[PDB]
Amino acid sequence: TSPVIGTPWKKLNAPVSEEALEGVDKYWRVANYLSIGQIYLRSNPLMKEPFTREDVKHRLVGHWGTTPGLNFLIGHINRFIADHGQNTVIIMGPGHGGPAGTSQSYLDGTYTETFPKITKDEAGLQKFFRQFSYPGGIPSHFAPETPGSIHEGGELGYALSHAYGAIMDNPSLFVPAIVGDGEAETGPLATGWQSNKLVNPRTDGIVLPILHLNGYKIANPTILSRISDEELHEFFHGMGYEPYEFVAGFDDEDHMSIHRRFAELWETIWDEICDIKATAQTDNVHRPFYPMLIFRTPKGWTCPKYIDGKKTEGSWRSHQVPLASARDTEAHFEVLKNWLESYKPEELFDANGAVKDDVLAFMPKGELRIGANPNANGGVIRNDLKLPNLEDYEVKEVAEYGHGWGQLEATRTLG
Amino acid sequence: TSPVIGTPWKKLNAPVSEEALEGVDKYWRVANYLSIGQIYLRSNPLMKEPFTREDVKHRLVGHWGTTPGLNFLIGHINRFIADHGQNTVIIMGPGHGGPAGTSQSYLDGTYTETFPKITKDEAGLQKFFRQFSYPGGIPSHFAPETPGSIHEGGELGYALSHAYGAIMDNPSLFVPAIVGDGEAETGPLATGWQSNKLVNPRTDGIVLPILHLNGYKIANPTILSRISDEELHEFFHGMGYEPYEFVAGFDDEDHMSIHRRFAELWETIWDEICDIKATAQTDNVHRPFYPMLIFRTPKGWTCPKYIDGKKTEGSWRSHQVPLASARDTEAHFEVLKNWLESYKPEELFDANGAVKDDVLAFMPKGELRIGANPNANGGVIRNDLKLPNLEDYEVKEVAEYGHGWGQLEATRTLGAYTRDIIKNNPRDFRIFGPDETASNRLQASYEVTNKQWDAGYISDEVDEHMHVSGQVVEQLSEHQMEGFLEAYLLTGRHGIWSSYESFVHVIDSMLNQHAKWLEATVREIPWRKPIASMNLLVSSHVWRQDHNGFSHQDPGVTSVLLNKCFHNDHVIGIYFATDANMLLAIAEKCYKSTNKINAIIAGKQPAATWLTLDEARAELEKGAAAWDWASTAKNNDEAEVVLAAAGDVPTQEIMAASDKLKELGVKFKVVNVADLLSLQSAKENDEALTDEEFADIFTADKPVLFAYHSYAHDVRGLIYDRPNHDNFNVHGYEEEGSTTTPYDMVRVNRIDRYELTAEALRMIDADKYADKIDELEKFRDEAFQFAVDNGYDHPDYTDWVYSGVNT
Ligand SMILES: Cc1ncc(C[n+]2csc(CCOP(=O)(O)OP(=O)(O)O)c2C)c(N)n1
Ligand SMILES: Cc1ncc(C[n+]2csc(CCOP(=O)(O)OP(=O)(O)O)c2C)c(N)n1
Ligand SMILES: [Ca+2]
Ligand SMILES: [Ca+2]
């Protein structure tokens, strides 16, 4: 049976600390750097004299558009897991956001603990950037080679079925299920919404759907992003959700002001989930309205606004890589240089090239870590079934009346 | 007259101090510890090593489920009392939560003050735990043995009627009245909510109903916990309450928050109560919406959430004890050990085994303490009534024109008398009656007071003798009337209520509980001073329910009261008013009495007056009497038969039989019984007639014809060991009757003057009188046939006057 890990469904009963939010901005900035690093750089991770086209991958493999959104969410969730001691597994619906997933495991320390060649320093950092979507390295998606992934999100649609399946008989487990807004256009996902009728808040755990309403899929706007907000909210309330919405990155709002609002909303949503779980200990025959979070951010968020006169942040044009090559010209290479410098890595890495102690101090520890949670490695929880004696079920009449006897339904015996 | 105690209806005006709330949490934790202790532990109260199963009681007796809930409330009420100086009596509906009431008394210092053997140290704490629901110890309920209690809550449902009685003519008294959600399903409780239209916020106190909505009774959920919150709110609003609801303990919210929320809420309600009381100084004709509190908390609050995989906290399983045994296994004793440790007694007790000073610093002092408040031992407040001269009510006409005079309605004389009791003892005496005060002829009291009514007035053409304040109260519920009067007596006041006889049975069970309360009090609770008697006029009785019929013909309350006549307790009076004058004598005796349920059977129909006041006083002091002036015999040897009557109508039929016997020249003795218990075996009752006195009245060898108001079984079982008992031929009500004539009522029950005369002849010489007997049986059928044919009674029955009357 599922382990009860940590201290589940605890309210903070305190405002989110400023130090932690500074941590989350640092997570967000490093994770965006490590993410652009994995996509663009074969060598010279930390951009030291000389940083040039020499240090840039020939073929650009990886998806950026979803990634900074996922980095924002996962930074905030990590702050959450540490503060609350909450048994948490994420479902990365936008699996193409693989850099968000590896970056996460590198920073939570489970990548080095699992792949010890990939050290916490400039040499490791160079290896780690190179191996992403690289021959004889690791995948571009959040693949099973990634600690914390029970879900690749290569074939979109199974984000909610996986999330609700995982919480069955798993009363202590919390699942942020990040659904893409393109993904939410698939059949499997469209009915996956309705699974809140087939789970019990007392005996199963809790799914939090996070719609990544980032406005676009590959080459198009998403339906849910371009319907009225009043429709979007009714849709979700019709399917048994309390929809909360968060909009950020469309204006000049400083990043710390965004982190403060997001954290305040997250813990409001969390108070309600804690209320649902407390009630269920008492009344679990009346279905509550489960919070869901509509996360509205520009696609490619924190990438260059415009590149070669085309809108890139807040556009489908950022889905894969906003800058299609950092080698073809030297203007293009200065865009990647400026883009990488914008996160100010001179503040994130020490001399050796280790992520600084102040960037990761807010992060959770041990089995609570997204990458080290046993649920993310089901195998370590799995026991052999106590099977009954197979004789007891055998159609015995074959020995006595011989081969080919009777008009039995074979399934009933399996029943 | 109720005393003004403390500083009543004062707002706080500052928030509740963090210091006082830390107190309350400690009270709560220690009261919970004391409460589990009393249930579970025979020894080693503080768990000093070694603490083992040898310290745990063999049989687990007591209730946990209700108790943590009570402890939280009482903790908070004690804070309230201390800060406000509020005159407060609590009514513990779920009286099976006695551990909370003993804990309260232990911690406020009334327990040690009352039982000095039970000390404020480890050794006292040990006797305290052992004594609870334990041979030679104390009850498992909030029994009269507990300081603070005027309500056991053994028999559920009297919580509100007791709460509302207490505040009547008690303007400073606050009564937080805690009601089981299971209790609330009973009929008596359901009607008790409506009491808010019968009290006045200027002249009466304030009752705050607290519904203890713990979700469960014994083995079931409660109706009020499983209807919508919206329905529950309209329900209380529709009965004239402003409902507030508090919900705590279904989640991880820490104890200090719970206490802060509750204390703010409590102070918001109290503010509203202080505004009701302040407004009532100016305007007491508009009925206010009285606050009530819905206290929704999990049953067994703070016990292990689960025991052996069974949900225990917030279940009916915590009803008695959540942990069935702490001896059978080590794992079980372990659960007990953990549970007891979770209140952290190391913080609450000093090494000497006393509760630390910082636990009880918030507590009230002196007479404001729940346990010490004189309203919870109303004997100490009780004064004698200033009674008018019985002489001024005497029917003088018996002395003038002779025994047997007139067509008076005896209950009218009790009315004139009680009227002047109210006049002379305002704020100290109440008539209750289930829409029957005028019907039983007690309305003379309307000359000096009114019926208290705090619902709508519409017109002087119908709203006669009604005011927002008055000493008479009427609802069509015997429960409410028994209930209000019981609590008005327990808080040190006085009263009478009246009922049609048949319907006294409605509140048989309430007579049982008050009798038990009184039985327990007079045996072993001498600190609890005596209260005025529960005086009950039983009238419109079986022999004259000829107009209402068979449903109204049951005098059996006599039989019920006889089952509380033991051990020389002397808590039951059963009086038969022979006439107006016997009724005054009984009345004065009852109104002077204490620690009794007095039942006065008196007719309201026109009837003869037999005795002067003096003759009645005399017969009453011994309980029975030969009627020399009525007797043709001169002594017991001459007497061929003894004619004995108990009840105003049997007396009438016997006296008339006596005139027919007188003409046949028979020698007979006439006996009247006014006190049923005077016939009780002198072995069982030291106040009964001695066998010598008995034999002197009933003769010892002569046969006795006994005409009895109620069922003959009552007498045949009272006199089983008495001299001459086998010669007693007892006639009583026999479940015969209908809507008919007065004569048919006596006839069909074989207690009419004709049958009595015949019976007397049979018993002297059957063969010698065979023909006068046969003439009498024939006439019995002719008078019936005369009624059937004319629709009134044969003029022989109707026009008869005792021979002893002169023009
Ligand atoms: C069933 C399926 N059809 C098509 C694709 C190809 N594909 C991968 S990403 C993508 C767009 C996804 O958009 P969205 O879910 O909005 O992700 P994000 O905007 O976060 O990149 C598509 C069509 C797929 N992975 N699965
Ligand atoms: C008139 C009456 N009928 C039945 C009972 C038996 N009885 C005693 S306790 C109880 C349940 C009480 O439930 P509730 O008032 O909800 O009490 P709590 O949950 O506070 O223990 C029952 C049925 C009783 N005491 N009185
Ligand atoms: Ca999208
Ligand atoms: Ca209850």
For residues B709 and B576, the answer to whether their CB atoms sit within 8 Å is yes
The β-bridge partners of A237 are none
Spatial separation of the C-alpha atoms in residues B566 and B564, rounded to whole Å: 6
Write out the DSSP string of A362-377.
Answer: TS--GGGSTTT-GGGG
Q: B480: which residues sit within 8 A by CB, 6+ positions away? A: B161, B188, B191, B192, B195, B432, B434
Q: At what angle do helices B411-424 and B580-592 cross, to 10 degrees?
A: 30
Q: Tell me if the bond preceding B345 is cis, omega within 30° of 0.
A: no
In angstroms, rounded to a whole number, what is the distance separating the alpha carbons of residues B210 and B695? 58
Structure tokens at A151: 């879900």
What is the Å distance from ligand 3's center to A222 Cα?
Answer: 7
Contact at CB, A11 and B314, closer than 8 angstroms: no
DSSP letter assigned to residue B501: G
Backbone torsions φ then ψ of B571, nearest 5 degrees: -105, 0
Residue B383 near residue B428, CB atoms below 8 Å: yes
| Contact: A281, B250; criterion CB under 8 Å | yes
For residue A135, what are the contacts with CB-CB under 8 A and spacing of at least 6? Answer: none
Looking at the DSSP bridge assignments, the partners of residue B673 are B624, B646
Closest ligand 1 atom, residue A156 Cα? 26
- Ligand 3 centroid from CA A319, angstroms: 8
Across the strands, what pairs with A180? Answer: A212
Longest dimension (CA), chain B: 96
- Residue A246's DSSP bridge partners are A295
Return the ∠ at Cα A153 (arms to A152 and A155), rounded to 5°.
Answer: 115
Structure-token pair, residue B618: 């005399």
Strand arrangement, sheet containing B241-247? B91-92, B174-180, B206-213, B290-296, B241-247
Token pair of B724, please? 């001459």
> Does B252 contact A279 at a Cβ distance shorter than 8 Å?
no
List chain B residues with CB under 8 Å of A275. 251
Atom of ligand 2 nearest to the CA of B509: 1
Q: Which of A35, A156, A185 to mutate to test the pocket of ligand 1 (most atoms within 8 A of CB)?
A: A156
Q: Give every CB contact of residue B357 below 8 A, 6+ residues apart in sequence.
A: none
Listed residue (B127, B142, B123, B119) closest to B62, CA to CA: B142
The distance of B305 to chain A (nearest Cα, Å) reads 10
Does A96 count as an annotated binding residue? yes
- Residue that the structure tokens 């001695």 belong to: B690
* Residue A137 counted as an annotated binding residue: no
Cα separation of A380 and B766, whole Å? 106
Token digits for B642? Answer: 């003894």
DSSP secondary structure, B247-295, as one string: E-SSS---HHHHHHHHHHHHHHHHHHHHHHHHHTTT--SSPP-EEEEEE
How many whole angstroms separate alpha carbon A102 and alpha carbon A63?
A: 13
Ligand 1: list residues with CB < 6 Å: A 65-66, 94, 96, 154-157, 180-183, 186, 212, 214, 216-218, 222, 299, 319
E strands, B523-610, are 534-539, 572-576, 597-601, 606-609
CA dist., res. A222 & res. B315, Å (int): 50
- B296 three-state secondary structure: strand
Q: Which of B156, B158, B179, B218 to mutate to test the pocket of ligand 2 (most atoms within 8 A of CB)?
A: B156
For residue B132, give the nearest of B321, B352, B271 by alpha carbon.
B321
Strand ranges across the sheet with A241-247: A91-92, A174-180, A206-213, A290-296, A241-247
Return the ligand number nearest the Cα of B66: 2
Chain A residues with CB inside 8 Å of B305's CB? 281
Kindly state the tokens that stand for B704.
């006795």
Helix, coil or strand: residue A405: coil
- Compare all CA atoms of chain B with the CA of A278 and give the residue at the minimum distance: B251
Q: How far apart are CA B79 and CA A144, in angstroms?
A: 61
Task: Return the best residue to mutate from B73, B96, B161 for the ligand 2 pocket (most ligand atoms within 8 A of CB).
Answer: B96
Let me know the angle formed at the C-alpha of B407 by B406 and B412, rounded to the nearest 5 degrees: 110
| CB-CB contact of B207 with B255 (8 Å) | no
Experimental technique for the deposited model: X-ray
Cα separation, B577 vs B589, whole angstroms = 12
Only one residue has tokens 């979109």, namely A156
Strand B241-247 to strand B206-213: parallel, antiparallel, or no bridges (unpaired)? unpaired
Residues of B in contact with A281 (CB under 8 A): 250, 305, 314
- Give the atom of ligand 2 at the shortest distance from the alpha carbon of B218: 11
Q: Beta strand pairing status for B606-609 and B405-409?
A: antiparallel
What is the side-by-side order of every strand in the sheet holding B624-626?
Answer: B624-626, B668-673, B641-646, B704-708, B728-731
CB A246 within 8 A of CB A293: yes
Task: Give me the residues paired with residue B642 across strands.
Answer: B669, B704
- Please answer whether residues B594 and B518 qualify as being in contact, where contact means their C-beta atoms are separated by less than 8 angstroms: no
Model resolution, angstroms: 2.5
Residue nearest to atom 25 of ligand 1 (CA): A155
Structure tokens at A184: 């939410």
End-to-end CA distance of chain A: 22
Cβ contact B250–A279 (<8 Å):
yes
**Cα A286 from Cα A279, distance rounded (Å):** 10
What value does the CA radius of gyration of chain A take, rounded to a whole number of Å? 24
Confirm whether residue A181 is marked as ligand binding.
yes
What are the residue boundaries of the structural domains of chain B, listed by start? 1-397, 398-623, 624-807
Residue B573 dihedral angles phi and psi, to the nearest 5°: -105, 130
Cβ proximity of B96 and B69 under 8 Å = no
CA distance A84 to A98: 26
What are residue B564's phi and psi, to 5 degrees?
-135, 35
- Cα–Cα distance list, B30 to B19, B83, B320, B345 (Å): 17, 21, 20, 7
Calculate the dihedral angle through the C-alpha atoms of A370, A374, A378, A381, rounding to the nearest 10 degrees: -170
SS3 per residue for A300-359:
CCCCCCEECCEECCCCHHHCCCCCCCCCCCHHHHHHHHHHHHHCCHHHCECCCCCECCCC
Q: How far is B313 from chain A (nearest CA, A)?
A: 10
Amino acid at the residue A156: L
The number of residues in chain B equals 807
For B468-481, give one letter per residue: b (16+ CB within 10 A) or e: bbbbbbbbebbbbb
CB count, 10 Å around CB of B587?
Answer: 26
Q: How far is CA A101 from CA A111, B93, B106, B241, in A?
A: 10, 61, 63, 59
Structure tokens at B5: 């105690």
Contact (Cβ atoms closer than 8 angstroms) between residue A100 and residue A6: no
Q: Tell me, rounded to whole angstroms, the distance of Cα A307 from its chain centroid.
A: 28
CB neighbours of residue A334 within 10 Å: 12
β-bridge mates for residue A247, sequence order: A296
Ligand 1 atom with least separation from CA of A179:
15
- Residue A58, marked binder: no
What is the rounded CA–CA span in Å between residue B290 and residue B209? 9
Measure A213 CA to ligand 3 centroid, in angstroms: 6
If 0-12 CB within 10 Å is exposed, 13-18 middle and 19+ buried, where does residue A114 land?
middle
Supply angle C-alpha B189, B192, B195, rounded to 5: 170
d(CA B649, CA A151): 96
Give phi and psi for B7, each to the nearest 5: -120, 95
Six-digit token string for B685: 């009752």
Cβ contact, residue pair B251, A10, below 8 Å: no
The whole-angstrom separation of Cα A387 and Cα A172 is: 27
Question: Which DSSP string corresponds to B408-433?
Answer: EETHHHHHHHHHHHHHHSTTSEEEE-
Continuous segment of H or E residues that includes residue B661: helix B648-663
Where b means 16+ CB within 10 Å and e means fewer, B322-353 reads: bbebbbeeeebbebbeebbeebebeebbeeeb
Nearest residue on chain A to B312, alpha-carbon basis: A282
Residue B48 DSSP symbol: P
> Which residue owns the Cα nearest ligand 1 atom 13?
A217
Please give the torsion angle defined by the CA atoms of residues A336, A342, A346 and A350, in that order, rounded to the nearest 10 degrees. -80
**What are the distances in angstroms from CA B268 to CA A63, B271, B370?**
59, 5, 22
Report the distance separating Cα B61 and Cα B134, nearest Å.
8
Q: What is the C-alpha separation between B259 and B75, in angstroms, rounded?
A: 10
User: Ligand 3 centre and the CA of A252: distance in Å?
Assistant: 22
In DSSP terms, which residues pair with B208 in a beta bridge? B176
What is the token pair recorded at A11?
């309210």
Q: Give the closest residue to B413 by CA, choosing from B650, B630, B654, B578.
A: B578
Closest CA to B197 of B475, B403, B485: B475
A278 contacts B252? CB cut-off 8 A: yes
* Two tokens, residue B626: 């030969």
Closest-CA distance of chain A to residue B160, Å: 30
How far is B283 from B276, CA to CA, in rounded Å?
Answer: 10
Closest by CA to A337, choosing from A323, A349, A348, A347, is A323
Q: Ligand 2: which residue has its CA nearest to atom 11?
A: B217
Q: Which atom of ligand 2 is nearest to the CA of B154?
A: 25
What span, in angstroms and rounded, lies between the C-alpha atoms of A276 and A208?
A: 12
Amino acid letter for position A388: P
Cα-to-centroid distance, A319 and ligand 1 (Å): 9
CB contact under 8 A, A282 and B252: no
State which residue of chain A sits closest to B247, comparing Cα positions: A279
Burial class (CB in 10 A: 0-12, 13-18, 19+), B69: buried
Q: How far apart are CA B39 and CA B98, in angstroms?
A: 10
Report how far Cα B598 is from the mean position of its chain's Cα atoms: 11
Ligand 2, CB cutoff 6 Å, lining residues: B 63, 65-66, 94, 96, 155-157, 180-183, 186, 212, 214, 216-218, 222, 299, 319
Report d(CA B228, CA B231) in Å as an integer: 5
Rounded to an integer, what distance in angstroms lies between the CA atom of residue B622 and that of residue B618? 7
Residue B299 CA to ligand 4 centre (angstroms): 7
Q: How far is A242 from A289, CA to CA, in rounded Å?
A: 5
Number of C-beta neighbours around residue A199 at 10 A: 17
Q: B529 exposed, middle or buried (CB, 10 Å; 0-12, 13-18, 19+)?
A: middle
Vertex A323: Cα angle to A318 and A326 (nearest 5): 155
Whether the Cβ atoms of residue B27 and residue B348 lie closer than 8 Å to each other? no
- Rounded Cα distance, B307 and B60, in Å: 16
d(CA B572, CA B511): 10
Mutate to test the interface with A, among B252, B312, B318 (most CBs of A within 10 A): B252
Question: Which residue shows structure tokens 């808080």?
Answer: B491
Distances (CA, A) of B619 to A95, B414, B581, B626, B731: 105, 19, 11, 9, 22
Q: Is B644 helix (H, G, I), strand (E, B) or coil?
A: strand
CA atoms within 13 A on the CB side of B778: 6
Is A319 within any annotated ligand binding site? yes
Q: What is the DSSP letter of B670?
A: E
Joined tokens for residue B107: 């911690």
Helix (H) or strand (E) holding A71: helix A67-84
* Helix (H), strand (E) at residue A175: strand A174-180
Residue positions counted in chain A: 415
B768 is in an annotated binding site: no
Q: Where are the alpha helices (DSSP H) in B465-576?
A: 478-490, 508-524, 557-562
| CA B749 – CA B733 distance, rounded (Å) | 6
Alpha carbons A174 and A6: distance in angstroms, whole number: 11
Angle between helix B67-84 and helix B255-279 axes, rounded to 10 deg: 50
Q: How far lies A10's CA from each of A7, A85, A268, B257, B735, in Å? A: 7, 8, 12, 16, 70
Q: Among all ligands shown, which has an atom nearest to the Cα of A64?
A: 1
Cβ–Cβ under 8 Å, residues A282 and B250:
yes
Residues of A in Cβ contact (< 8 Å) with B314? 281-282
Produce one character per residue of A201-238: b if its CB has 16 or more CB atoms within 10 Å, e if not. Answer: beebbbbbbbbbbbbbbeeeebebbeeeeeebbeebee
Residues with Cβ < 8 Å from A406, sequence gap 6 or more?
A395, A397
Q: Say whether B457 counts as a known binding-site residue.
A: no
Q: Going by C-beta distance under 8 Å and a sequence separation of 6 or more, which residues neighbour residue B247? A: B296, B297
- Please tell me the distance from the alpha carbon of residue B625 to that of residue B643, in angstroms, as a whole number: 12
